[PDB]
């Protein structure tokens, strides 16, 4: 009972705008959590969205505490770090690992879309890994409700990260939320398989993007990707968001359902 509420801040996990993420260890139990420290409406929405979240591939929210002009968000600690540091530059990672991470990303995104939430900034920096390398979607600072009382709200706000944003966000005034997150998942899949981003932004003025629309797959990063995951990327990275593949159909794709990876190495004797 005494001192069970005391947490020691032992190391900086992440820094940026606006604030830092610190690893916190409980004085009594030694339980590890991540404390998001935001130096104070945007944070009020983040807390509200985080309270709704309960899924094995979404970073858990334990609660928050306001100490004057500072908000403390208590969130799941993921010891495996970011997916970003598992991607070898210009190489990627083994195809079975990327497939497993992509299945977990799809389970997380299905869950969020199912409760009417769009993340809007899916990228490897935001995809965290637990001790068993289970992928968790993190940072709901740009997230929003796109479906309320079974009525879909079209989005118009410009946000995300240019190499991961869908082309409609740059060409159209209004757009559906769900195909935007599907596109960013395809850029994450491209990053995991080739270890590089295909373009700075998806616009006609961008040569790499024009080459993709012209199906010049003999060029990088596409030439490093096998034909089965590349056929899936041809369905995701579709300019027209109405023709773009939906997640129920991604789950029926040949590469998505290809047996590739063995389960976690279990102790055995002969
Ligand atoms: C903006 O971040 C969040 O909203 C959020 C929610 C939950 C978390 C989180 N839980 N566990 C971690 C996070 C962020 C995070 C980052 C890292 C990578 N940290 C390295 C530490 C040593 C190295 O030298 C620098 C980077 C390792 C673990 C973790 O972050």
Here the tokens at position 99 are 């497939």
Q: How far is CA 264 from CA 94, 131, 261, in A?
A: 15, 12, 9
CATH class of domain segment(s) 89-270: mainly alpha
Q: For the CA atoms of 178, 41, 141, 76, what is the dihedral angle to 10 degrees?
A: -120
d(CA 242, CA 47): 32
d(CA 98, CA 92): 9
d(CA 41, CA 234): 39
Partners of residue 36 on adjacent β-strands: 21, 73
Mutate to test the pocket of ligand 1, among 9, 20, 73, 78 (most ligand atoms within 8 A of CB): 78
| CA 136 from centroid of its chain's CA atoms | 8
For ligand 1, residues with CB inside 6 Å are 13-14, 21, 34, 36, 59, 75-78, 81-82, 128, 138-139
Phi-psi region of 150 (alpha: psi -120 to 50; beta: other; left: phi over 0): left
Domain with CATH 1.10.510.10 in the chain: 89-270
- Asked: is 1-88 a CATH 3.30.200.20 domain? The reply is yes
Annotated resolution, angstroms? 2.2
Domain with CATH 3.30.200.20 in the chain: 1-88
Residue partners of 177: CB distance under 8 A and separation at least 6: 113, 118, 120, 144, 146, 152, 153, 154, 155
145 φ, ψ to 5°? Answer: -85, 120
Nearest to 98 by CA among 87, 109, 110: 87
Distance spanning both ends of the chain, measured CA to CA = 47
Here the tokens at position 217 are 């797959």
By what method was this entry solved? X-ray
Residue 145 burial class via C-beta count within 10 angstroms: exposed 0-12, middle 13-18, buried 19 and up = middle
């Amino acid at each position: 009972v005494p001192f069970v509420e005391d947490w020691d801040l032992v190391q900086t996990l992440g820094e940026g705008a606006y604030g830092e993420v610190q690893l916190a260890v409980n004085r009594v139990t030694e339980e590890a959590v991540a404390v998001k420290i935001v130096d104070m409406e945007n944070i009020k929405k983040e807390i509200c969205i985080n309270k709704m979240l309960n899924h094995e591939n979404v970073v858990k929210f334990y609660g928050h505490r306001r100490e004057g002009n500072i908000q403390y968000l208590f969130l799941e600690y993921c010891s495996g770090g970011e997916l970003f540091d598992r991607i070898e530059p210009d190489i990627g990672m083994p195809e079975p690992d990327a497939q497993r991470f992509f299945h977990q990303l799809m389970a997380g995104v299905v869950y969020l879309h199912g409760i009417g939430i769009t993340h809007r900034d899916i990228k490897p920096e935001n995809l965290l890994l637990d001790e068993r390398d289970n992928l968790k979607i993190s940072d709901f600072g740009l997230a929003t409700v796109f479906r309320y009382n079974n009525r879909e709200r079209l989005l118009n706000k410009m946000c995300g990260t240019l190499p991961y944003v869908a082309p409609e966000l740059l060409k159209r005034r209004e757009f559906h939320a769900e195909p935007v997150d599907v596109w960013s998942c395809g850029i994450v899949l491209t990053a995991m398989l080739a270890g590089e981003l295909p373009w700075d932004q998806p616009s006609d003025s961008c040569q790499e993007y024009s080459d993709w629309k012209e199906k010049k797959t003999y060029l990088n990063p596409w030439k490093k990707i096998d034909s089965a995951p590349l056929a899936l990327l041809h369905k995701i990275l579709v300019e027209n968001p109405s023709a773009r593949i939906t997640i129920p159909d991604i789950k029926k794709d040949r590469w998505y359902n290809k047996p590739l990876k063995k389960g976690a190495k279990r102790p055995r004797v002969t």
